[PDB]
């Protein structure tokens, strides 16, 4: 449609943007971030619904940023592609510590799969009985 939105924060040369060709068109508004602050830029600019955050990202500690992300929306699906033991550290540090987790920036095939594994696909979806 068009209302699909995701952020991807990592320092992989062309994975961030290949996610764009991968979803940004039709899958989701997948944007690229070199810092969580850059992700904050887009989260306030385009307001993607999902966030991919790596704290292992050169620049800033994405951990803090993703904490703020749930803190901004609470509907935003905060997904972690950093030290996935942050459901230990990042969670107890603040609030949620991100949901779907991965310790490695992996091949996008598993990522697109993970997207269609985790995403609702239910009846109520987000919060709306009978989409109108």
């Amino acid at each position: 449609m068009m209302n699909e939105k995701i952020l991807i924060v990592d320092d992989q040369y062309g994975i961030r943007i290949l996610l764009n060709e991968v979803f940004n068109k039709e899958g989701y508004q997948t944007f690229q971030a070199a810092n969580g602050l850059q992700a904050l830029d887009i989260v306030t600019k385009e307001r993607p619904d999902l966030v991919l955050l790596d704290m292992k990202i050169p620049g800033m500690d994405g951990i803090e940023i993703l904490k703020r992300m749930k803190v901004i929306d609470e509907n935003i699906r905060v997904i972690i592609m950093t030290a996935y033991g942050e459901l230990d550290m990042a969670q107890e540090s603040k609030e949620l510590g991100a949901l779907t987790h991965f310790a490695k920036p992996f091949d996008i095939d598993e990522i697109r799969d993970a997207v269609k594994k985790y995403l609702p696909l239910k009846s109520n979806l987000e919060h709306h009985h009978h989409h109108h």
Side-chain angles (χ1 to χ4, degrees):
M1 295 183 65
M2 227 176 67
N3 311 159
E4 32 262 64
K5 297 178 291 300
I6 296 180
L7 216 295
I8 302 81
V9 189
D10 67 69
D11 189 45
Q12 306 288 211
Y13 195 84
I15 301 182
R16 292 173 309 224
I17 185 64
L18 88 81
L19 259 298
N20 286 214
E21 281 49 89
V22 142
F23 288 127
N24 202 268
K25 328 148 50 67
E26 50 180 88
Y28 297 92
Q29 203 348 92
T30 55
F31 217 89
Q32 51 260 207
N35 347 272
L37 293 180
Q38 204 290 150
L40 174 66
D41 275 290
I42 311 304
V43 81
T44 193
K45 281 181 78 294
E46 309 304 286
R47 282 79 76 157
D49 302 282
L50 310 216
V51 169
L52 269 182
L53 222 319
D54 183 21
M55 170 278 298
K56 305 171 291 77
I57 229 293
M60 297 295 295
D61 301 68
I63 179 177
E64 306 285 73
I65 286 72
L66 66 80
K67 307 172 171 172
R68 190 175 205 132
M69 293 293 184
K70 316 102 59 287
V71 148
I72 311 186
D73 208 72
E74 301 177 277
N75 288 265
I76 188 169
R77 310 308 210 278
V78 285
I79 309 287
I80 157 174
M81 55 192 294
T82 188
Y84 82 114
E86 258 181 56
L87 43 70
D88 168 273
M89 180 179 61
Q91 133 165 148
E92 300 183 90
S93 186
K94 184 51 189 175
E95 182 188 51
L96 289 179
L99 289 183
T100 307
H101 45 273
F102 296 104
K104 312 179 70 62
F106 192 81
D107 188 287
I108 73 291
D109 198 292
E110 182 171 86
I111 273 57
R112 55 192 287 233
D113 180 80
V115 178
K116 61 179 299 172
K117 291 297 185 185
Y118 162 80
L119 88 316
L121 284 180
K122 72 159 62 73
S123 44
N124 173 79
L125 297 177
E126 300 297 83
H127 178 231
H128 245 118
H129 56 275
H130 283 216
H131 179 95
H132 58 283

